[PDB]
Amino acid sequence: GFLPHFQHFATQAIHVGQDPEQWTSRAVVPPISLSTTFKQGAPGQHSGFEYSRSGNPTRNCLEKAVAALDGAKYCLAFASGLAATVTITHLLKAGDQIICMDDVYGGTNRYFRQVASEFGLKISFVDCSKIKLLEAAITPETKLVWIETPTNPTQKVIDIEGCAHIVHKHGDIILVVDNTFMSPYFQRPLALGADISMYSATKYMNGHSDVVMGLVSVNCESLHNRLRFLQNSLGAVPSPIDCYLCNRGLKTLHVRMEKHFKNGMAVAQFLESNPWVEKVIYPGLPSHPQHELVKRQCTGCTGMVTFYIKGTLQHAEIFLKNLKLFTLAESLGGFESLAELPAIMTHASVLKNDRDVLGISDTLIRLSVGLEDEEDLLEDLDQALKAAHPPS
Amino acid sequence: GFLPHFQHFATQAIHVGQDPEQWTSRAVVPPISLSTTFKQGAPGQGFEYSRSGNPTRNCLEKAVAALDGAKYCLAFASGLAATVTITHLLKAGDQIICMDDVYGGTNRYFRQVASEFGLKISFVDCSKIKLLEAAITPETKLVWIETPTNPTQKVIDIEGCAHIVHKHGDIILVVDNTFMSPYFQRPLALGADISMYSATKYMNGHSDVVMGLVSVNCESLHNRLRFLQNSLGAVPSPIDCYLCNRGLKTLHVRMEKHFKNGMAVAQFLESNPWVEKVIYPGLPSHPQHELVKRQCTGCTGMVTFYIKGTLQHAEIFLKNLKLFTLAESLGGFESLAELPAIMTHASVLKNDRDVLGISDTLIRLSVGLEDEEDLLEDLDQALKAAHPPS
Amino acid sequence: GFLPHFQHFATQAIHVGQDPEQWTSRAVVPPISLSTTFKQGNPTRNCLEKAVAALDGAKYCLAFASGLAATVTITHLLKAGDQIICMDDVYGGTNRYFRQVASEFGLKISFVDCSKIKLLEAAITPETKLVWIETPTNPTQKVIDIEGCAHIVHKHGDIILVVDNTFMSPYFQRPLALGADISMYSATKYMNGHSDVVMGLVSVNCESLHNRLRFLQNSLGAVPSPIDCYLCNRGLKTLHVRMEKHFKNGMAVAQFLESNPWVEKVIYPGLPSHPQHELVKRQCTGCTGMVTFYIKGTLQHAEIFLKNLKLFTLAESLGGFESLAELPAIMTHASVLKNDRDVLGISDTLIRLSVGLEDEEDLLEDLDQALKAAHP
Amino acid sequence: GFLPHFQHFATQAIHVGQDPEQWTSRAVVPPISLSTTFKQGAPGQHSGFEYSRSGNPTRNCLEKAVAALDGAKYCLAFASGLAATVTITHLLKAGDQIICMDDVYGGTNRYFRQVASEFGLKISFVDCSKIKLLEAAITPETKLVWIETPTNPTQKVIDIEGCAHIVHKHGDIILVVDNTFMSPYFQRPLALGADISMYSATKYMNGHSDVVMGLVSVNCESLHNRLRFLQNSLGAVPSPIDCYLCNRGLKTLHVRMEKHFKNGMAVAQFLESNPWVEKVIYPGLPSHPQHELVKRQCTGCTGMVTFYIKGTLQHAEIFLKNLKLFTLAESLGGFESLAELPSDTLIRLSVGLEDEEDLLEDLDQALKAAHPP
């Protein structure tokens, strides 16, 4: 009942940007070019690479590949997801307004609220999961709308096409979708009318818990030109070696994400039928309030499962303490299963009062279900919940 | 008669941040930790997320700080990213004074980008201390200088400039020390608040890492910078951190050889009849040569000159080089030549270039670590091929 | 109908040798330790060896600079005068090493078709100390009864049975579980699976055999880079999901080729047409991406077929994410003597495919149009 | 009065193998090519890379550079110095003899004695500091003579050309020189008549204590072809990443080695003036018994300094225990200063690139702890 899978995604993940004819060696895998600079035939040269920060072989290959995966004309790679966000925010100018989804990655909240806001930029956090609130929030000064769907960590789901229609109805406003949770395998914001599909590649895109990186895919020519200028001019660029590592991780994205889905659904179903679990938030469950919308705008679901443990903070901590396969740690989207308590870990950067309004309570637990054997994951959760045994 | 060499520099380059006691393995060289995340004993709890901090970067930062005589250092994805991050110390309404001759990208960022977010930018010849004094306003919060400047190699008295900037109030003085390295110049010892590097150049020195570095002593300033390193996320790969830290361990021996080769080149060019003017701080003809000896322990591989004739002669010279490579960047083991007006400084407005003296006959060399006579031979034959009007 | 999948494989691939407690940082991925000197082998290699050992069901594993270096090191377990029996169809480089190098150092090399157990039983001599098999064989994909061969080789004497498990991976076949003494890989293929690491791996249970190998790992110094160990160990964490996709795509490719009237014969362990198909299901949990076929016609048709592929790439090697095609007689097995090739069936029209992880429909389309170009 | 320094050595270190025209990108530094395989135009054609183990861009650039630094036609890179040695030994066949120097690297000794000897190869250890001993050990079965100079820890110096003439006069005999501890900046065995100049790159060649690698430089065409066949066939090959790192390390070999020499001489001289040092062995001191051979055979000396402390083993131990800058370890030839106690009073130093005065102070300080006033 989900959107059919995107045609040629695996083939393109494996081949786009990776053409052996690019290289004098005819290497089937692109070389890692670390060189900072490149020999020119003559000064002032509308041709070839000039300086690594501006462009380089290995990054350019990754970017072509990711663009294809997004269904985009262009992609730009960055030192981090947060650096991608900063770079996108520099598309604006003093006097402009930014609307940000109310529930986002704690670092996104922090950057807008505490940093961007000091540079002539007005920041409004709006629950864009209610389309009419986004509509009522847009002002003549609105230039950027920043959404996550599903949101990190409460996994509210936003109608991308509906928001796109609203945002584009009047004025000249950029709609960004931070697609970190879904990956382009399961969701294509550009197809749904977003102007930018952004990633923390640190999570699923790379998927190997060993690269910090951001990615920004785009179709519109002037917007690309503006972004490319800032990639070079702000210089928040990724190592070519990280570009290689990410591009390598991309070649298994399809097979990893299918297994994140299988395992994530299994975990989500298990927790929902568990008497020590108050509530489960998983887009793949009929219980999710936007489950049908998910099926309309996605081809599947990820390994991110949010739930509320019964009881108190104590029970949440005893549960986490008793995990023997899941690891207590920040981040998500890697091969290993992770568990965290956002209110005190990843979203400690979000003001407590906002946490409270958003439902990021002492008992909200976020899981990043990895690629381990399903039976081992379920047994780990089962024993850890029994160790906590909150009132049922 | 330069400043004596900084004590323990080589010892510290090799040892600071590299204690084997840090690792279960007792490795003499720090491992490259690529892990994005780290296990916690309880929620909130050591390392927690690579961007915020990680073993390999933290090791490099300690080493660089030692080399600057600094308490603290922060590493960034590029020299430009360092510059952007420092600029985020400010807020709408603040003014930035920038040295009039800087790396084209610095000019581009300030002029075209930072100016759009409520920051006022003034480009001022800070090599003339009275122009700076006149330029300071109550809104001035950042003074950004290079010395020597890229590419015309104007030299600024850092201590004099610091004294001026700090006389009235809360103004940050940055010295972009990319060209000299902390081996030859220590801006923090001379009263700068920040010593910044494009580590892409000499710090790494192996033409294979893009990175920036920022050293600081002030607690408050460090904390503000640290916040922005995490919050803006323009952070370097841990593997690039390892490569740069490895490059640092030959910085002393590379820099001495850059100085030797650079001086030989500068002297060759100045007595060559096809050369109009040479700009090298190590030569007595440099207008600030005496200042340079007072604030530096030596000179670098960067040599700027003006060829006689026109752009056509500059182009013939460049095209005839056989050892020197026509390329952007600087500070590596290999010798590079370029024409800033058309290449690295095409991002500087033409009227600004003309005002600064970045003409179509200005050539910049980055003299590398090849054999001196081979480098002088290459230049000699290329100038002969150009043979401009003498 | 296959052997049930090995329990905990995915969990072990991701976690064994990866305990964060090993590091002062509590890193969830092991650091790359390059240091050659230590204040008074290496962590990254040890983590990899532990993981691979677990995946094989083995007590130990030793990593090498390449599959050939693994093979050379194993051969140094012997001494002048010992005899090696080698499967008659093997990787060209294995053939070359035994026939051209090892033979020159007082070792006797006999090539025998161990797919016929009776022939192995007959070839054994009191001087036989090493039996070296591949299953399925590279490139003709003959299948050897590993347990049957083990019972035979271990009936008398002291003979090491090596299974080069490169083609299958331990996800699909565990030679140590079936009685082999050594499960060996060119990790360069499926184990790493990303076409960017050259490495050998040797999994072993027996204590004195391990000590003997460990000594040779040390003494001959054919050891892998710690960074390559990290890359391989990283590759390992998707082995389960890669191999399952290789199986689905490889089976679709095989079935497509066998139903194609321009194809003379398909050799794929997962097809019922394969002579050892039932044996494969008894000793394996599934099949890989390796598909061998004979094109109808001559060398010319094979060459036109290969020229016309637009997704499969013409190249040596196998086991990677990308689909590859080759003509073994001219490429990877040019190192096998012509006469040996002809006896083995490695003819002018034997094509070997390493089916990768691309979309199934894209791969079948490529094969279809290319066969059509050769046989209009 | 050493051999004059080799012309264009720094230029060649930086540029040979590193031509930007090799790459479509025109990168000034060679890319690290990890690809195991390469697209072919047609089966079995006579061009390009086909398989990484057989040859690859990054390794090939390294071999080019090292060959030039040795003054050699060819170079072959291996996974380790030991893998180089094993590969070299596979040039022979059952029945041949190897003559090896007595004071060889333990790894070399161990391989020949414990492994090679079991595969039909006769190994004979001989004192090659006495040229007539070497002479009289040669037999019709002799195919390889393996020397190393200076020796460690005692720094005996072997006359390379002397050995070469003796060996070559007797026929089809391969003379190998392990040049690990000199580098070709200071010693060119092929220029002095050796057939093979061989390295553990792990020490000075790379010099950054982060690469295990072997290198083998050769001029003779058939010898090369034989070695190349075995590089592919035995497969003890280096990672392309390690090749990159070694090639990067080599770009500073000249400036590193001059500093090792400078600190090394200073340390050697300090120890030689010190009344609590019984004896110093350093080829750069007039006191070295082969000091004149060294100046005829070499352009300079390294950071390797061996000395005997006055007293007993206890004094040596107190010395080692009190070092605060020198690090106690079992390795060598990197940028940091190391000390080892491998007689009872014999200490081996690998003097690194730290500040000379810090290094002298550390030694002085430690000697005073062993022999208080």
Ligand SMILES: *Cc1c(COP(=O)(O)O)cnc(C)c1O
């Ligand atoms: C990880 C995270 C980010 C931040 O990206 P970094 O790579 O950590 O800078 C942004 N959005 C989401 C949804 C995230 O999970």
Ligand SMILES: *Cc1c(COP(=O)(O)O)cnc(C)c1O
């Ligand atoms: C190179 C350069 C910069 C910019 O550094 P990047 O690493 O290229 O971003 C800044 N200042 C000077 C003097 C430079 O030469």
Ligand SMILES: *Cc1c(COP(=O)(O)O)cnc(C)c1O
């Ligand atoms: C690739 C191959 C080898 C040789 O391995 P290398 O890593 O290339 O030295 C050995 N056995 C089989 C089955 C192979 O396919």
Ligand SMILES: *C(=C)C[C@H](N)C(=O)O
């Ligand atoms: C980001 C992934 C979480 C982290 N703790 C931060 O604050 O940046």
Ligand SMILES: *C(=C)C[C@H](N)C(=O)O
């Ligand atoms: C920086 C090294 C110069 C460059 N071409 C740029 O524009 O950033």
Ligand SMILES: *C(=C)C[C@H](N)C(=O)O
């Ligand atoms: C090995 C994968 C094939 C190669 N051509 C060789 O002969 O080693």
